Amino acid sequence: XXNXX
Amino acid sequence: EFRMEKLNQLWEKAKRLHLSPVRLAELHSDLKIQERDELNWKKLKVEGLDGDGEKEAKLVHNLNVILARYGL
């Protein structure tokens, strides 16, 4: 997703 | 619509039989006139004024022939 690292 | 639970049950189940509308409509007219008959039966039952119980046989047999007549 767009909130992982 | 109808007063009693049993008439509503017959009414949903009659629709579940997909019967013809003219037959299905005649069902309610025979049950709705029985609705007024059952009400005076019930009033005379709880109050106990129907000392002979004459009003019970005449709606029991009417309901039975209604079930037989209309294909239930």
């Binding site: 997703x1 767009x2 909130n3 690292x5 | 007063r3 009693m4 639970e5 049950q9 189940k13 579940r16 039989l17 019930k42 709880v46 109050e47 079930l67």
Partner: protein, 1114 residues
């Protein structure tokens, strides 16, 4: 000692106006001896033959009716005077002979039960009157699996008939269970059949709901209102006060709203609620309901003594009054009286640092170390140390000034620094390297770097350092836990897991962000899971509670300012920064959804500093209203976990465990509330609490080794290797066998090597099978995220009861276990035995396999409405998906509802990049090198980005980490990163091979040829006394390379020298035809190279068909 910077000793008191220190005896004395009286604050101490007498006469039917019959609710003998004017309408209730049921009717007992409309409006069986569970006599059968709104009793006249009757239609199953069903009717899972028209509709026709499962409902008509659960209703049914679709979508406050007309000026409406011209009032004409405009003509009604009791002040108008309250006082609902405003709670932003409530106005004060500037509200830090920001890029920890003037590297060359924190006591810095899965520390003067934690760190997310109790707290996102340890990295202990709330609705799923508050002994953390929340726990693992749970989707960031004690956090999805009290009350938004993607924020004085992922920027602004927003810096890589380095951000406090470890054996943790302390034990220890002390009794598995002093226990493969791990040194005893393997690797008893995961997995992997030995595996234990079969092999906790043989002996799928086990807190259980996340219940998808997670009757109720702040409701079904999944290029609603009309969806003004299609992607994904829009519009029309300090540029202009340069392998796709190495010096603590390439120094002189040319072994001292370099078991290549004995002349060029393939050695190696056969050149060619078409030996004997075709199909 000296005085803390800008502060005063606890033995004295600080003046507010100038920061000077005076003794406490001058405080609270009544004499303003300070510069502005800050010492003397007010908070201190101060015909008559046809009927009979029992019957009422009637005319037409010649009937006579009892006296109690009439005036009951209907005309008994069709008399028009029966109801209206024969009895008193409400002089009395209908007395005890007929029980009370509505005012216009009455009920004689049993009718409250039978289900017939005997009060005129069905209200006889309302509330909890009667008939909780009806019963069936002879010739009747009960629909036991049913609820009130369907049925509970049916006659035998309908059992095993032609049409289903009960709720689940069990009447037709019974013992009947017929066979005959054809293609003319739809077939259900349970076996019953129904007409094709009764598929994919609003009715549960088959009982089993097989006629509805898997259907795809087309959208409703134009005149058909659609509810959130997917049921179409007539628009006439909307806002008729009847729940026409169950979930209440058609009956809700703001959809069924008719806001009253404004009529702002002139247009003086009267008190009956309709707007009329202003001049009509007291025009001597009664134009409103009841003298609403004519009081004769109005005058002030407060003039008489205490009429309407206007508490503070009053004012009048043409036809009314209105009281008023002085500033600092608010009127309450009675519209007559005023109460004091707690401005410190109702309006926190008025005072910059601290607030004290007064009856009326308020007074703002500053925390010690701060002085209030002459404006009366803005405190200023008094220490002559200027703060600076410390934030982490993926490769760097960088130093940035508060105003942004200076910018420099604190450190570089790291793998991936996702979090960091500082300690002002030792001037030390801590950070988590997510790429290496280690936690390091170093002094701020850039020396004494070391690694304190390197084991069982599956996925660390955020860390926080406790300056008071010298403890280190960090979150793990894979184990879903909150850990604790001393600053040196010992005595690790689990202090939180599973769920937080009493309902198990908010659980550890995606922990991120952490902030300690040692003053009150609390730890605050955030989770961005499906049920996102901000939790709280005591520093010792008590007081689990939920602080924020509403209007929160992606809480990446969290912090506390320590001066106002306000809690601060930011949401990446909703895009806000919002602050609240420590208990979660009185929340206020700083930025109202305008931030692209904040990740970490921090506070100092009056300024909030946050790191933005989408813009890759560090920004600052006012901490209360967001004014003065300024971009400080903008980097190539994403910024993580910014921190303001200043001693005021770690306020001084007494240590409850002072100079004695609190008398605790291993750990002393601050009690919730801060006042007390609690002794604790590490992970593999048992707390045998005694009368006046806690005993930490060691309890470690058979795969673990207990150290000499019982200070810790370590995995069994950490015993007998190169490094001493225990403090005692028993890790490496004198009677220690030779170490054949590398670090972090299990060693077989015969010298073979295998990974630690090979231990007790029931698949023997060592040559001796010692990895599955009874003594070793008898008391094996594994992590909290795994479940252990009776076979003593550990599998992930979610691999149970899935009809897959994850364990060898089906213990995971055994029916006895799959019926008695529970799910872990926060997980839903299926009748199949599956454990699934609670979010997976009622989401259309068949997750249990048995559709147990999708009860259609229950899933469509009001209890599963989507959270309208963050979730988007699918059109044709009851599924809810998060808003960020809307037109992302993937079918998430199972009906493609979320991908419809993305053209109308606007991107966020600054953080997103619109694709060729109408999708919005984060700007950080522009020109990254991979297609994320689904049409390559992001990577088109791009220019390669410039390299940073730790990066190296290939011939293709793409940047790679400098560590990959000259490491024997190419990463640029060509010769670029190994173009020349012979005349280059490489990162420290690395050994450069003679061929120019360089390896980590630990791989030098350890037998294995780690350099390509084996130069890491070609010049080393003699390993064994009598001159030998390898133990006898291994072979010794003439270039001093150690090699496994069975590798001898197997056809692989194993010794880089070539000593492995001498023919004289080759001929005498034992061989076996199915595995190794002799080639006619005396070379035992590997058996896999026979009939391979390749001349592994120089005469083609390995390819001759005579002895490698199939004689018996072999």
């Amino acid at each position: 000692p000296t005085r803390p910077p800008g502060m005063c000793h606890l033995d004295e008191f600080q003046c507010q106006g100038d920061g000077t220190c005076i003794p406490n005896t001058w405080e609270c004395d009544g004499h303003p001896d300070c510069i502005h009286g800050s010492d003397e604050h007010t908070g201190c101490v101060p015909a008559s033959h046809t009927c009979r007498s029992n019957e009422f006469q009637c005319l037409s039917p010649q009937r006579c009716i009892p006296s109690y019959w009439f005036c009951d609710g209907e005309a008994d003998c069709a008399d028009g005077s029966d109801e209206p004017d024969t009895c008193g309408h409400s002089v009395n209730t209908c007395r005890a002979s007929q029980f009370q049921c509505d005012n216009g009717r009455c009920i004689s007992g049993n009718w409250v039960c039978d289900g017939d409309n005997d009060c005129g409006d069905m209200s006889d069986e309302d509330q909890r009157h009667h008939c909780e569970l009806q019963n069936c006599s002879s010739t009747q059968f009960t629909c036991v699996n049913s609820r009130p709104p369907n049925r509970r009793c049916i006659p035998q006249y309908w059992v095993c008939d032609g049409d289903a009757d009960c709720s689940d239609a069990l009447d037709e199953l019974q013992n009947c269970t017929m066979r005959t069903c054809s293609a003319g009717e739809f077939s259900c899972a349970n076996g019953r059949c129904v007409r094709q028209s009764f598929r994919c509709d609003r009715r549960n026709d088959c009982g089993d709901y097989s006629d509805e499962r898997g259907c795809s409902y087309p959208p409703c008509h134009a005149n058909q209102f659609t509810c959130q659960n997917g049921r179409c209703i007539p628009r006439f049914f909307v806002c008729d006060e009847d729940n026409d679709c169950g979930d209440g979508s058609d009956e809700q406050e703001h959809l069924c709203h008719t806001p009253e007309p404004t009529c702002p000026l002139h247009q003086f409406r009267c008190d009956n609620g309709h707007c009329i011209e202003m001049g009509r009032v007291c025009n001597h004409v009664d134009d409103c309901s009841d003298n609403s405009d004519e009081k004769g003509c109005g005058i002030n009604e407060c003039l008489d003594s205490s009429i309407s009791r206007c508490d503070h002040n009053c004012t009048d108008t043409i036809t009314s009054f209105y009281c008023s309250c002085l500033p600092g006082y608010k009127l309450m609902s009675d519209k007559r009286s005023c109460v004091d405003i707690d401005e410190c709670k109702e309006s926190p932003q008025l005072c910059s640092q601290k607030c004290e409530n007064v009856v009326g106005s308020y007074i703002c004060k500053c925390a010690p170390g701060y002085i209030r500037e002459p404006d009366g509200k803005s405190c200023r830090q008094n220490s002559n140390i200027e703060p600076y920001l410390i934030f982490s890029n993926r490769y760097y920890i960088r130093n940035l000034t508060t105003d942004g003037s200076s910018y420099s590297l604190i450190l570089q060359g790291l793998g991936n620094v996702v979090a960091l924190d500082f300690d002002r006591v030792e001037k030390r810095l801590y950070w988590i390297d997510a790429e290496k899965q280690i936690i390091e520390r170093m002094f701020l003067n850039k020396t004494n770097r070391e690694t304190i934690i390197n084991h069982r760190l599956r996925r660390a997310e955020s860390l926080a350092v406790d300056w008071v109790s010298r403890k280190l707290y960090w979150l793990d996102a894979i184990l879903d836990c909150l850990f604790v340890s001393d600053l040196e990295g010992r005595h690790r202990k689990m202090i939180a897991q599973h769920c937080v709330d009493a309902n198990n609705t908010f659980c550890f799923e995606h922990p991120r962000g952490i902030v300690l508050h040692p003053q009150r002994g609390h730890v605050y953390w955030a989770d961005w899971g499906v049920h996102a929340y901000i939790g709280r726990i005591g520093m010792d693992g008590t007081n689990k509670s939920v602080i924020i749970s509403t209007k929160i989707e992606w809480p990446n960031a969290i912090t506390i300012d320590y001066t106002n004690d306000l809690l601060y956090w930011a949401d990446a999805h909703l895009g806000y920064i919002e602050f609240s009290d420590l208990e979660g009350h009185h929340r206020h938004t700083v930025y109202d959804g305008s931030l692209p993607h904040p990740f970490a924020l921090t506070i100092f004085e009056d300024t909030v500093f946050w790191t933005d992922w989408n813009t890759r920027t560090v920004e600052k602004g006012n901490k209360y209203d967001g004014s003065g927003r300024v971009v400080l810096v903008n980097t190539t890589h994403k910024p993580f976990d910014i921190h303001v380095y200043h001693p005021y951000r770690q306020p001084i406090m007494s240590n409850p465990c002072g100079t004695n470890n609190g008398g605790c054996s291993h750990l002393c943790l601050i009690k919730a509330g801060g006042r007390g302390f609690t002794c604790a034990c590490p992970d593999d220890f048992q707390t045998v609490q005694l009368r006046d002390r806690t005993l930490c009794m060691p309890m470690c598995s058979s795969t673990q080794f207990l150290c000499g002093n019982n200070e810790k226990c370590i995995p069994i493969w950490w015993k007998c290797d190169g490094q001493k791990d225990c403090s005692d040194g028993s890790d490496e005893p004198d009677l220690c066998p030779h170490r054949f393997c590398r670090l972090g690797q299990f060693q077989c008893r015969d010298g073979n090597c295998t990974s630690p995961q090979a231990l007790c997995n029931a698949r023997q992997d060592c040559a001796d099978g010692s990895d599955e030995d009874r003594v070793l595996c008898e008391h094996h234990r594994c992590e909290s995220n795994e479940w252990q079969c009776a076979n003593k092999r550990c599998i992930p906790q979610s691999w149970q009861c899935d009809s897959v043989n994850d364990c060898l002996d089906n213990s995971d799928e055994d029916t006895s276990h799959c019926a008695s086990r529970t799910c872990r807190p926060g997980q839903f259980k299926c009748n199949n035995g599956r454990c699934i996340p609670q979010s997976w219940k009622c989401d259309v998808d068949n997750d249990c396999g048995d559709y147990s997670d999708e009860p259609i009757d229950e899933c469509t109720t009001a209890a599963y409405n989507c959270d309208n702040h963050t979730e988007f409701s699918c059109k044709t079904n009851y599924r809810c998906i998060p808003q960020w999944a809307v037109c992302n290029g993937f079918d998430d609603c199972r009906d493609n509802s979320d991908e419809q009309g993305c053209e109308s969806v606007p991107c966020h003004p600054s953080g997103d990049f619109r694709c060729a299609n109408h999708h919005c992607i984060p700007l950080r994904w522009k020109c990254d090198g991979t297609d994320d829009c689904g049409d390559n519009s992001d990577e088109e029309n791009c220019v390669p980005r410039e390299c940073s300090e730790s990066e190296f540029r290939c011939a293709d202009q793409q940047c790679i980490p400098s560590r990959w340069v000259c490491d024997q392998e190419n990463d640029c796709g060509d010769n670029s990163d190994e173009r020349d190495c012979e005349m280059k010096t490489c990162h420290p603590e690395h050994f450069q091979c003679t061929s120019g390439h360089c390896v980590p120094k630990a791989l030098a002189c350890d037998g294995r040829a780690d350099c390509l040319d084996a130069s890491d072994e070609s010049a080393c001292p003699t390993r064994f006394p009598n001159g030998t370099y390898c133990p006898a078991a291994m072979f010794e290549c003439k270039n001093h390379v150690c090699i496994q004995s069975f590798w001898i002349c197997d056809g692989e060029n194993d010794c880089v020298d070539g000593s492995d393939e001498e023919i004289h050695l080759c001929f005498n190696i034992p061989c076996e035809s199915p595995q190794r056969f002799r080639c006619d050149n005396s070379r035992c060619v590997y058996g896999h190279q026979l009939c391979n078409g390749v001349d592994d030996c120089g005469d083609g004997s390995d390819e001759k068909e005579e002895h490698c075709r199939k004689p018996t199909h072999k």
